[PDB]
Amino acid sequence: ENVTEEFNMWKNNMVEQMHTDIISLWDQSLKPCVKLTPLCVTLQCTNVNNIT
Amino acid sequence: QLVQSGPEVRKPGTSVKVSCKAPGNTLKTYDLHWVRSVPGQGLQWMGWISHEGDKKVIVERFKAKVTIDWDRSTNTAYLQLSGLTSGDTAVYYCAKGSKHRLRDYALYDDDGALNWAVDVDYLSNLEFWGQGTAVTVSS
Ligand SMILES: *[C@@H]1O[C@H](CO)[C@@H](O[C@@H]2O[C@H](CO)[C@@H](O[C@@H]3O[C@H](CO[C@H]4O[C@H](CO)[C@@H](O)[C@H](O)[C@@H]4O)[C@@H](O)[C@H](O[C@H]4O[C@H](CO)[C@@H](O)[C@H](O)[C@@H]4O[C@H]4O[C@H](CO)[C@@H](O)[C@H](O)[C@@H]4O)[C@@H]3O)[C@H](O)[C@H]2NC(C)=O)[C@H](O)[C@H]1NC(C)=O
Numbered sequence: 247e248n249v250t251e252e253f254n255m256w257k258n259n260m261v262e263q264m265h266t267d268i269i270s271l272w273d274q275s276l277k278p279c280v281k282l283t284p285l286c287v288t289l290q291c292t293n294v295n296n297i298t
Numbered sequence: 299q300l301v302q303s304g305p306e307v308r309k310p311g312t313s314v315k316v317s318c319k320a321p322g323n324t325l326k327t328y329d330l331h332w333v334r335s336v337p338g339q340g341l342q343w344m345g346w347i348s349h350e351g352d353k354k355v356i357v358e359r360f361k362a363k364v365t366i367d368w369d370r371s372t373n374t375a376y377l378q379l380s381g382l383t384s385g386d387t388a389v390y391y392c393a394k395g396s397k398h399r400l401r402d403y404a405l406y407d408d409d410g411a412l413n414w415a416v417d418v419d420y421l422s423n424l425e426f427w428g429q430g431t432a433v434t435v436s437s
């Protein structure tokens with residue numbers, strides 16, 4: 247009550263901290279995942295069936 | 299030069315054997331080929347078994363009745379015929395030549411190794427030929 251505080255969503259650092267967070271978790275999870283490096287090979291490809 | 303087994307006569311029905319020998323062991327890196335020469339009908343390619351021992355190609359038209367062996371210890375080429383029909387009455391030549399083992403599609407690995415490679419080999423030439431062995435089949 248009787249409290250006035252200035253706010254600034256654009257200079258707020260919580261968004262920067264949480265963006266850095268999200269990047270960190272994204273980087274963290276896929277690190278113990280299978281590396282798809284043995285797939286970049288020349289693919290022989292043809293047009294696909296019943297399609298629109 | 300090369301040496302071949304002497305002329306042979308066979309009753310149709312049984313099998314025949316032909317031996318092609320190099321002088322000593324001077325022709326071991328070169329690959330081995332067998333050819334046939336029906337008079338007035340050109341020449342046919344019986345097959346080959348290479349030199350490292352990793353190929354045994356024999357034309358399917360003669361696959362059933364013809365076998366090609368190589369004895370390393372004596373360095374001797376063996377040609378075995380089974381059907382011995384009238385069409386086999388001709389001259390068989392042993393040839394020593396060279397191939398080109400090119401490397402076609404090969405799957406390198408991520409670390410740089412060689413997982414596998416088809417490395418199909420191409421026939422280059424037949425420098426050395428035997429004196430020719432005549433096989434006569436008469437009924
Ligand atoms: C990077 O990767 C490439 C892949 O292409 C590689 O190039 C190739 O290397 C192989 C390995 O040597 C070469 O294979 C040899 O080719 C020669 C013919 O070369 C001539 O002709 C080609 C065109 O076809 C020219 O481009 C070239 O400049 C030459 O003029 C064949 O004659 C060789 O055959 C011998 O070896 C075979 C086994 O490898 C035997 O089966 C065969 O009977 C031949 O035997 C030879 O050795 C015997 C003793 O072992 C001897 O007794 C015989 O008399 C005979 O001399 C061989 O197949 C291939 O040509 C290269 N080029 C291509 C397009 O594939 C590079 O070398 C590589 N770079 C590196 C590793 O640094």
Ligand SMILES: *[C@@H]1O[C@H](CO)[C@@H](O[C@@H]2O[C@H](CO)[C@@H](O[C@@H]3O[C@H](CO[C@H]4O[C@H](CO)[C@@H](O)[C@H](O)[C@@H]4O)[C@@H](O)[C@H](O[C@H]4O[C@H](CO)[C@@H](O)[C@H](O)[C@@H]4O)[C@@H]3O)[C@H](O)[C@H]2NC(C)=O)[C@H](O)[C@H]1NC(C)=O
Nearest residue numbers: 346347348350351352353354355356365366367368369370
């Ligand atoms: C490591 O790498 C080395 C060379 O880099 C390999 O050594 C060669 O391996 C090949 C297999 O890819 C071997 O080739 C095979 O040899 C067999 C030996 O057969 C003997 O007996 C028959 C009668 O049953 C004889 O006719 C023959 O001349 C031999 O005396 C052959 O039977 C095989 O033939 C089959 O395959 C060919 C095509 O490959 C067909 O055309 C035939 O009809 C048949 O189906 C074949 O040729 C070769 O002998 C090996 N050489 C040496 C010096 O070892 C190693 O195998 C490799 N090792 C590993 C673990 O990768």
Ligand SMILES: *[C@@H]1O[C@H](CO)[C@@H](O[C@@H]2O[C@H](CO)[C@@H](O)[C@H](O)[C@H]2NC(C)=O)[C@H](O)[C@H]1NC(C)=O
Nearest residue numbers: 285287288289290291292293294295296297298
């Ligand atoms: C993609 O290509 C594969 C390889 O041809 C197709 O799989 C074959 O499909 C045919 C019918 O088109 C079947 O007879 C074969 O049994 C299938 N397997 C193999 C190993 O040939 C596959 O259907 C294609 N995908 C499509 C058309 O959507």
